[PDB]
Amino acid sequence: SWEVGCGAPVPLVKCDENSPYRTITGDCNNRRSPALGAANRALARWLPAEYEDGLALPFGWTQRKTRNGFRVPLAREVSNKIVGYLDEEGVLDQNRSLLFMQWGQIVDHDLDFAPETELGSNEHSKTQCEEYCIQGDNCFPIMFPKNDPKLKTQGKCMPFFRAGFVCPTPPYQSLAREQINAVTSFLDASLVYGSEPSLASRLRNLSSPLGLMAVNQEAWDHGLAYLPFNNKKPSPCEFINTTARVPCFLAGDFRASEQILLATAHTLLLREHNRLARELKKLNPHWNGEKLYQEARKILGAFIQIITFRDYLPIVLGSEMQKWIPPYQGYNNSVDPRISNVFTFAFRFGHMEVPSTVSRLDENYQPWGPEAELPLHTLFFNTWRIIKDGGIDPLVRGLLAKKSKLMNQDKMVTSELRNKLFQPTHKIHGFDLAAINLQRCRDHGMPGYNSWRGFCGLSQPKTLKGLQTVLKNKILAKKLMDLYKTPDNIDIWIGGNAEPMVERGRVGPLLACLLGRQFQQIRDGDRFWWENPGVFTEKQRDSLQKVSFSRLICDNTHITKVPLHAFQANNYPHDFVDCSTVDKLDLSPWASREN
Numbered sequence: 196s197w198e199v200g201c202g203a204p205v206p207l208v209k210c211d212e213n214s215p216y217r218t219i220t221g222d223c224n225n226r227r228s229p230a231l232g233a234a235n236r237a238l239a240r241w242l243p244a245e246y247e248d249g250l251a252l253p254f255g256w257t258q259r260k261t262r263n264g265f266r267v268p269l270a271r272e273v274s275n276k277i278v279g280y281l282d283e284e285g286v287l288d289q290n291r292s293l294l295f296m297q298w299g300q301i302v303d304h305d306l307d308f309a310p311e312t313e314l315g316s317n318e319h320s321k322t323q324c325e326e327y328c329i330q331g332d333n334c335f336p337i338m339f340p341k342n343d344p345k346l347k348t349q350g351k352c353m354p355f356f357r358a359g360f361v362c363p364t365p366p367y368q369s370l371a372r373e374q375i376n377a378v379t380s381f382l383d384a385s386l387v388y389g390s391e392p393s394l395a396s397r398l399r400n401l402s403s404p405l406g407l408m409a410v411n412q413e414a415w416d417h418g419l420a421y422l423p424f425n426n427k428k429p430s431p432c433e434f435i436n437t438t439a440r441v442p443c444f445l446a447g448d449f450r451a452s453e454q455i456l457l458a459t460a461h462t463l464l465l466r467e468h469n470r471l472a473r474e475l476k477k478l479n480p481h482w483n484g485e486k487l488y489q490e491a492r493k494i495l496g497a498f499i500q501i502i503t504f505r506d507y508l509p510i511v512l513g514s515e516m517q518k519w520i521p522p523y524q525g526y527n528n529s530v531d532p533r534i535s536n537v538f539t540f541a542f543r544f545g546h547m548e549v550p551s552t553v554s555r556l557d558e559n560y561q562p563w564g565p566e567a568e569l570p571l572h573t574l575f576f577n578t579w580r581i582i583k584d585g586g587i588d589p590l591v592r593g594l595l596a597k598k599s600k601l602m603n604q605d606k607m608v609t610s611e612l613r614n615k616l617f618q619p620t621h622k623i624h625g626f627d628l629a630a631i632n633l634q635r636c637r638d639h640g641m642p643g644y645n646s647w648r649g650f651c652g653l654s655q656p657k658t659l660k661g662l663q664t665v666l667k668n669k670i671l672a673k674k675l676m677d678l679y680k681t682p683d684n685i686d687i688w689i690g691g692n693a694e695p696m697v698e699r700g701r702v703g704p705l706l707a708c709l710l711g712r713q714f715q716q717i718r719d720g721d722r723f724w725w726e727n728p729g730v731f732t733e734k735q736r737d738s739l740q741k742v743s744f745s746r747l748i749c750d751n752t753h754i755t756k757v758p759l760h761a762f763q764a765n766n767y768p769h770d771f772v773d774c775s776t777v778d779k780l781d782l783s784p785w786a787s788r789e790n
């Protein structure tokens with residue numbers, strides 16, 4: 196018995212049950228519950244929220260309020276003692292390319308975004324948080340521990356603002372606070388096309404009727420398209436180099452320019468849409484723009500689905516894949532396709548896969564110029580290195596030929612993210628993504644590690660020795676007990692990521708369970724899943740079965756040598772074959788028989 200429809204923010208229910216295409220918002224996918232999976236709704240709760248006061252205050256908020264009898268440790272202290280390391284030697288994943296990391300980020304961005312509240316809308320309250328390190332309302336600063344090096348150079352805290360939540364935004368909502376997912380839960384290329392109508396429209400080229408996405412008019416990549424710039428200010432991408440004055444890209448997702456390899460991946464995706472729109476016009480010149488946009492959008496969405504479920508998930512989940520994501524059996528309208536709050540933390544395992552450097556490689560997969568290799572932190576919000584320093588081709592080559600970082604219980608997150616992160620409006624390369632993650636799962640009222648172990652049918656260690664056995668690591672176990680004092684209090688992000696990885700995968704048991712279930716649900720509860728009877732023709736699906744990340748690159752760059760299995764660790768020229776030996780996507784089956 197509780198409020199059973201607090202859905203005032205955004206009440207669109209404007210459904211056509213005939214339509215053969217997805218809405219932009221995700222609405223109308225589920226017929227019986229048309230808002231399921233739609234953007235701008237609460238994240239699903241797989242377990243009840245756990246706040247210090249039952250309703251909204253994070254654990255950690257009030258000094259003298261314990262969690263199960265013990266103070267929760269500072270996020271930055273956990274970062275410093277557990278998550279950090281010095282030596283990047285030996286940290287690379289000998290069987291995952293850098294594309295493996297990058298595809299994770301892409302998928303993540305398609306599925307979830309819980310942006311900071313906008314209550315620092317015309318308030319020095321946003322600057323006062325930064326300035327004076329003063330907790331209150333949505334300002335929840337990450338305070339430095341006593342012996343932190345950053346205390347000496349950066350003041351008392353790192354700023355942090357609580358995530359947006361449904362119902363009111365300035366006051367509270369009755370029942371526990373529920374954070375918003377601002378993008379569509381469906382794996383639907385929302386990161387290319389947008390999750391809101393206005394953005395979706397702004398991204399389109401409605402000046403010609405070719406059903407194209409807008410492209411950059413100020414720059415081109417050896418005649419290939421770039422994303423439009425976002426001509427609004429202040430621009431983080433301008434801030435990081437005011438000489439170059441190259442703004443951020445405008446994509447279907449706000450976060451597209453956070454790092455140069457994300458921007459790169461967005462760039463491939465846009466080009467594929469345009470290329471598909473132009474093929475379809477040839478095969479159907481009687482098709483108008485809307486029809487061309489929608490049909491291209493639908494192919495791209497399928498492409499992302501296939502890559503993710505056929506190529507990516509099996510080498511994340513490994514032995515657990517088959518357990519959580521059995522072969523498809525059609526749409527089930529009883530499944531909840533909403534992204535869970537916990538999943539938005541579980542999928543941050545990617546953070547331990549980001550290595551300290553990025554390379555540009557030439558057409559011989561050799562170093563491109565004299566600074567071919569660059570530190571990751573110089574590449575946050577960096578578009579000028581694309582526009583003015585070789586286009587995406589050198590970066591796409593590095594994605595193929597360089598390696599992801601390997602999760603390591605002793606080497607968890609690179610200092611390029613731990614210590615050198617840049618965030619818009621904060622001016623310095625001085626933040627800590629690990630700390631942010633821990634603060635965020637308190638912000639989101641996350642149950643602790645054992646609650647999730649319980650949920651997944653796994654043991655719940657209560658002692659040091661129990662923790663040691665589960666983590667198979669005495670020293671890590673001991674550091675966690677010293678900080679958290681009971682495994683019940685371990686933040687899920689760090690707890691999940693601390694578990695040794697499953698056979699053939701890159702996450703442990705708990706994360707495999709949380710991730711696997713989520714991915715099962717977004718497949719099974721999606722009316723427009725690519726393999727659902729009805730969505731594509733049988734001839735179309737035989738065509739779509741052939742897609743590969745290799746063909747995506749071949750079709751949309753000037754690269755001509757590629758691996759067959761782009762997520763594996765590949766070395767040139769041994770594991771690189773010519774683009775010609777690579778299957779294409781035959782759009783023959785999209786010819787209509789109208790005459």
Ligand code: HEM
Pocket residue numbers: 296297298299300303307308309310453454538539540542543544545546548549628631632635
């Ligand atoms: C250099 C690479 C990357 C950077 C710079 C980066 C940065 C960030 C930042 C700043 C946030 C917001 C944190 C917060 O305020 O709570 C975030 C969230 C997130 N990241 Fe990463 N990240 C990277 C790679 C990845 C990868 C590889 C994955 C997954 C495979 C991933 C998954 C996520 C997810 C799920 C979130 C939560 C999104 C949401 O629901 O709000 N990221 N990341």
Ligand SMILES: *[C@@H]1O[C@H](CO)[C@@H](O[C@@H]2O[C@H](CO)[C@@H](O)[C@H](O)[C@H]2NC(C)=O)[C@H](O)[C@H]1NC(C)=O
Pocket residue numbers: 435436437438439579583584
């Ligand atoms: C800001 O961007 C400018 C211009 O893109 C950078 O300058 C160029 O740097 C290259 C090497 O990458 C030199 O070969 C050129 O001579 C420079 N050209 C110009 C326009 O001066 C500059 O290094 C960047 N600064 C920072 C701090 O990132």
Ligand SMILES: *[C@@H]1O[C@H](CO)[C@@H](O)[C@H](O)[C@H]1NC(C)=O
Pocket residue numbers: 290510699763
């Ligand atoms: C490398 O990775 C793939 C996918 O996990 C696997 O099939 C292959 O056998 C692996 N090679 C070795 C020897 O680890």
Ligand SMILES: *[C@@H]1O[C@H](CO)[C@@H](O)[C@H](O)[C@H]1NC(C)=O
Pocket residue numbers: 400402403407408409410411412
């Ligand atoms: C839209 O398409 C027309 C015709 O191809 C092209 O000339 C124009 O530059 C495009 N506009 C944008 C901003 O993408």
Ligand SMILES: *[C@@H]1O[C@H](CO)[C@@H](O)[C@H](O)[C@H]1NC(C)=O
Pocket residue numbers: 527528529530
């Ligand atoms: C659909 O999902 C529900 C709940 O997840 C499950 O109980 C039911 O068996 C499924 N229905 C079909 C047709 O498989």
Ligand SMILES: *[O-]N=O
Pocket residue numbers: 425427429430431443449452
């Ligand atoms: O211009 N915004 O990322």
Ligand SMILES: O=N[O-]
Pocket residue numbers: 450453
């Ligand atoms: O991924 N950027 O917040």
Ligand SMILES: [Ca+2]
Pocket residue numbers: 305306378379380381382383384385386
């Ligand atoms: Ca989506």
